[PDB]
Amino acid sequence: SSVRFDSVGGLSNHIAALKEMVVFPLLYPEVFEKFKIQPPRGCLFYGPPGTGKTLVARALANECSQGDKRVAFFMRKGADCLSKWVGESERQLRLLFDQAYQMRPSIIFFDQIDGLAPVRSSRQDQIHSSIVSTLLALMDGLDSRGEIVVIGATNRLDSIDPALRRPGRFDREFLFSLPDKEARKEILKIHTRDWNPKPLDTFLEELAENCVGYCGADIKSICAEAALCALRRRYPQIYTTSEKLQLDLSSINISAKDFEVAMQKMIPASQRAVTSPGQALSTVVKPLLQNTVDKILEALQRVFPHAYQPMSFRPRILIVGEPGFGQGSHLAPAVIHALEKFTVYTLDIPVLFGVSTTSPEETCAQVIREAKRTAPSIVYVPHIHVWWEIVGPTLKATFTTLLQNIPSFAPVLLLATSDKPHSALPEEVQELFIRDYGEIFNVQLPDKEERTKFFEDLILKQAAKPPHERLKNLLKTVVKKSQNYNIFQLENLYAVISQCIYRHRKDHDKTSLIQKMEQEVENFSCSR
Amino acid sequence: LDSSVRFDSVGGLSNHIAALKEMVVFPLLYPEVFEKFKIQPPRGCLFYGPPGTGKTLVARALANECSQGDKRVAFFMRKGADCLSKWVGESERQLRLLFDQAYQMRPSIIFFDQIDGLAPVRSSRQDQIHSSIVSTLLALMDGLDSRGEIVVIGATNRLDSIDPALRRPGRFDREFLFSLPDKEARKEILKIHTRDWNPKPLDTFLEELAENCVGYCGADIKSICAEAALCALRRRYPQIYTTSEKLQLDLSSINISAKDFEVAMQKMIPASQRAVTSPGQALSTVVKPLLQNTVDKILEALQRVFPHAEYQPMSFRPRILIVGEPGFGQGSHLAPAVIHALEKFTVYTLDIPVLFGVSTTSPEETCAQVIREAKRTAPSIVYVPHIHVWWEIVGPTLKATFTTLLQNIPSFAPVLLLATSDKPHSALPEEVQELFIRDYGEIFNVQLPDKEERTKFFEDLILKQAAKPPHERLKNLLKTVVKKSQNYNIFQLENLYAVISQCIYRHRKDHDKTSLIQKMEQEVENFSCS
Numbered sequence A: 001s002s003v004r005f006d007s008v009g010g011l012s013n014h015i016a017a018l019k020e021m022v023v024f025p026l027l028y029p030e031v032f033e034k035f036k037i038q039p040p041r042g043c044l045f046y047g048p049p050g051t052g053k054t055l056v057a058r059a060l061a062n063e064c065s066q067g068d069k070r071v072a073f074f075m076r077k078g079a080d081c082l083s084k085w086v087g088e089s090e091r092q093l094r095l096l097f098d099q100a101y102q103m104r105p106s107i108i109f110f111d112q113i114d115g116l117a118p119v120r121s122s123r124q125d126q127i128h129s130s131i132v133s134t135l136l137a138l139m140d141g142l143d144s145r146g147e148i149v150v151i152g153a154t155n156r157l158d159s160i161d162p163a164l165r166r167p168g169r170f171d172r173e174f175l176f177s178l179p180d181k182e183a184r185k186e187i188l189k190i191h192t193r194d195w196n197p198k199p200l201d202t203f204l205e206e207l208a209e210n211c212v213g214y215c216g217a218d219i220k221s222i223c224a225e226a227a228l229c230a231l232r233r234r235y236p237q238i239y240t241t242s243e244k245l246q247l248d249l250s251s252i253n254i255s256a257k258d259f260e261v262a263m264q265k266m267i268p269a270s271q272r273a274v275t276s277p278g279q280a281l282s283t284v285v286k287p288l289l290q291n292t293v294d295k296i297l298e299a300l301q302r303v304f305p306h307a308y309q310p311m312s313f314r315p316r317i318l319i320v321g322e323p324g325f326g327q328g329s330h331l332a333p334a335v336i337h338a339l340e341k342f343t344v345y346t347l348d349i350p351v352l353f354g355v356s357t358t359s360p361e362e363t364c365a366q367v368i369r370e371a372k373r374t375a376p377s378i379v380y381v382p383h384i385h386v387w388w389e390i391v392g393p394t395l396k397a398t399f400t401t402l403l404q405n406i407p408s409f410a411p412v413l414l415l416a417t418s419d420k421p422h423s424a425l426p427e428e429v430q431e432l433f434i435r436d437y438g439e440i441f442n443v444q445l446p447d448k449e450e451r452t453k454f455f456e457d458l459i460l461k462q463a464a465k466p467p468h469e470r471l472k473n474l475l476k477t478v479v480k481k482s483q484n485y486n487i488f489q490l491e492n493l494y495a496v497i498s499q500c501i502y503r504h505r506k507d508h509d510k511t512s513l514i515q516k517m518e519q520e521v522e523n524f525s526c527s528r
Numbered sequence B: 001l002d003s004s005v006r007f008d009s010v011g012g013l014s015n016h017i018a019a020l021k022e023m024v025v026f027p028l029l030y031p032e033v034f035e036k037f038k039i040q041p042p043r044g045c046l047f048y049g050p051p052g053t054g055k056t057l058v059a060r061a062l063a064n065e066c067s068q069g070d071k072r073v074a075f076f077m078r079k080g081a082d083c084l085s086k087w088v089g090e091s092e093r094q095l096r097l098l099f100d101q102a103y104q105m106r107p108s109i110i111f112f113d114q115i116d117g118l119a120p121v122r123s124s125r126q127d128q129i130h131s132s133i134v135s136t137l138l139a140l141m142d143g144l145d146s147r148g149e150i151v152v153i154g155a156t157n158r159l160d161s162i163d164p165a166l167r168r169p170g171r172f173d174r175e176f177l178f179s180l181p182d183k184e185a186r187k188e189i190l191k192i193h194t195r196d197w198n199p200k201p202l203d204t205f206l207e208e209l210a211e212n213c214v215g216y217c218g219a220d221i222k223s224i225c226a227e228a229a230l231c232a233l234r235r236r237y238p239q240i241y242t243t244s245e246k247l248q249l250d251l252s253s254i255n256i257s258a259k260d261f262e263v264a265m266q267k268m269i270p271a272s273q274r275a276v277t278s279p280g281q282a283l284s285t286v287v288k289p290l291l292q293n294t295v296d297k298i299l300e301a302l303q304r305v306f307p308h309a310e311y312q313p314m315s316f317r318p319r320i321l322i323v324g325e326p327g328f329g330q331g332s333h334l335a336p337a338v339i340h341a342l343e344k345f346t347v348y349t350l351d352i353p354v355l356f357g358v359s360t361t362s363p364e365e366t367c368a369q370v371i372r373e374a375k376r377t378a379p380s381i382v383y384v385p386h387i388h389v390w391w392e393i394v395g396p397t398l399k400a401t402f403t404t405l406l407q408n409i410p411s412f413a414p415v416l417l418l419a420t421s422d423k424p425h426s427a428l429p430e431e432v433q434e435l436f437i438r439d440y441g442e443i444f445n446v447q448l449p450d451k452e453e454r455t456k457f458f459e460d461l462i463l464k465q466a467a468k469p470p471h472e473r474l475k476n477l478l479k480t481v482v483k484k485s486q487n488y489n490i491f492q493l494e495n496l497y498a499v500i501s502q503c504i505y506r507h508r509k510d511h512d513k514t515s516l517i518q519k520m521e522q523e524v525e526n527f528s529c530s
């Protein structure tokens, strides 16, 4: 009862839209007399789980409860109005709507309406069709319900009777989506506000950009796993006894390493049932391909200028390379990760076919509807030289005519990759990418500069640790030998050279494992 | 209850009020015409249609037109099913009371709002209470012991989920369709909801509005007015949302203009296309000066073959096939614009993402459903875009269904078949070639726009926007663009347009030009497409 639009970070247009349905007709009643208005009194929250849909209703209740113009608040769970006797289910609804009419102004909040108002079908019990009919007949009927603001919250929007969604019943619909890098930082400032050792802004700014895919609840949860980790690290004897000890509340300060352990043990809620098709370069491969990622992002910026309003025409790009250059394995997911705040919808083999009781066409038809709705979006088809060889002609005819229906100036990017050059691709694909327009990117192998930094830290610093003139020669030899390896062979040779280092952890003296490195780099053969 | 609604705001529905005052008003006013022939006029209706169209508004107007009048017809109003009761025989008994109380105060009206929640179709799998309350509702509407002078009315959104024994001449002998308004009917709802305003809006402005509100239904038209007023209030006082306090605002600088009716229609989705998109869209503001004339020519050809696009106009198997080269924008820009121009005709689509896009339904079952629906509600369109591909994507069972179902249609039924193709007519298969009879006028050939069309396309962008503060060589650039882009199709044209708009965007904040004009010049010079 102490949350008042203060803890709600990242959602500011929704709150502004919400104080003109509830607050303004009470504060400025003479503006709505000039035009005879009666502003909208129906909204519908929807989105993925954890994204601030119940926090906003809580804050609005507390905002209107404490003030001059006291408003009521009636709260309902999913389907708690159901009774077993044949006339009582829809008598409790009539009772609730009439009780709210003598308290007005009031607010009726329906939490999780997915279980109250399904689409009326004959293949179910009458109890649901009767409840929906009375609900819609009571909301907007012959009686002018009055100053009652009805709100509902849901995850599954399209499973609600389409007669409830029209001006007069549920006028406005509100999308609560995952936070971007700038709202994650607001949420982090909120949840780490009354802390003894107030964290710096430059630290929260680095945290907000590492917690990609998080949503509200996940940030609030790491802000607590960090404290539990600090506690466990400071007092290891608190898990081997069954009584209260003298906990010194002064040496329990939270450090960055605790946040690191918290973020290492935790998976966000969004990618728990699925996996995201976008992943940053590992810390090993990062000093090898970030320059290529930057070049691809510049090409995108040329074709997809959403990365006066920017105007883009059929945003499309095709990343081509040789098999092994890592364009569908390291590069395109890193570009997808760099372009977060744009929702991604993959169409690849283990997604069309790796799920049954749904056709490939029914998934290809929905991943484009949802991409048109939430534009600017991305539609990801990797390895099209095989994707186009593992699909039927019905799926080709559906796909190639579903992106011909997208508006001419639709901010929807089609990103794809291939191993065979653009000329070796079949027809009907060479006409989707028009490199006269800059819709083709040709990857090339990393330069010497990058290849040296790929190996330096391994062969120089971690080479001779705790528990120096020949190592330069070894590094030069390694970089000279591998001037034509692709990426797979490069990182293979990286693990082979790191193996010897591991078997000599307990050796206090070097010069015995240097021969190991010499012979391992010598007897390492590839292909190419 | 509001006592001010009395057939004054119910714009658009005049053929229903006229049929509704000869069931209630006339047997009281002229009770000698009905005992000349001894006819006993119809005393049953059934309102139905899409959500938000004037079904309940007409009942709210009838209640007032009869209560506050000479004669005293009584009104009984029931919501979905509020006759149900907890104890055993009490659900049915209540109904009888409602019909007896109505018999003692006759003449009277009973109005069942959302009657599809009271009287479903009787099925042996559901509760016995519903199957036994339908059989007692339809035993006291028309059984022995004549009803009397009660007028029963029922309003619903699902018509075919009502027991078919109720839809009968003697229980519900008149079904009324409340469909989406057309243009002339939207420019009456608009004059009703802005009836008592300040500086009353011009009829020319209300016509400009009624043209752009396609897909709106009564409630959306009433809602855009509120949204426009709110947008104006926000535009005038931006500091009225950052105080949570009462302030002093002069109720005179808050006049509603245009550009607030225009921003309201951005964040507004009609109720009809909120879960499914219609296959008809008008030309965007960019492409319009490039293809409106082609749309008009197509509509003239339609006028020839489909006379119902102005005795009576008589037609015979109205068909047309819009052919053009690939890229000429006939199945992507033109056919939906022709569909959108022909509103007030119902439009069904038969294309791949719709046949092979929904499961648990045969592909040759939807094809049999849409043709039946189109027959039922003629004049109607059946839209098959890209038949040069549609024909090589369906099986022979679906072909034998489709070609023999468009023959079962009566000859003079105004059901139009609209299709497009990229292959010329000669390159199509025979079984399709023989469905269009060019010597009959059933083929239209598209051609590239002319110099005039291209000049008007590029003019306002190269001339009146390149200056745009945050004149003799701009016209030379315009001439060069209109020259070099003379063998392009529409995709390449509207691609060059976006390529030139990306420069102007990049050079927003530069107060001085001549860094934008040479940029423009090199961009147009470097553009290569074919």
Ligand SMILES: Nc1ncnc2c1ncn2[C@@H]1O[C@H](COP(=O)(O)OP(=O)(O)OP(=O)(O)O)[C@@H](O)[C@H]1O
Pocket: A007, A008, A009, A010, A011, A047, A048, A049, A050, A051, A052, A053, A054, A055, A056, A153, A154, A155, A176, A187, A190, A215, A216, A217, A220
């Ligand atoms: N913008 C935010 N600022 C602070 N905390 C947030 C924010 N968004 C979400 N949270 C945290 O997430 C919790 C859930 O909010 P809410 O439950 O309304 O989301 P939801 O969409 O209802 O989730 P679900 O759909 O699973 O019910 C809150 O208790 C809050 O701690």
Ligand SMILES: Nc1ncnc2c1ncn2[C@@H]1O[C@H](COP(=O)(O)OP(=O)(O)OP(=O)(O)O)[C@@H](O)[C@H]1O
Pocket: A136, A140, A163, A168, B009, B010, B011, B012, B013, B050, B051, B052, B053, B054, B055, B056, B057, B058, B156, B157, B189, B192, B217, B218, B219, B222
């Ligand atoms: N012809 C009209 N003239 C003026 N207003 C109209 C008209 N038609 C509809 N409306 C608006 O629509 C609102 C009511 O909708 P309606 O009376 O059609 O019930 P309904 O919403 O159709 O029932 P359901 O919920 O099944 O759709 C009214 O408030 C009215 O402002």
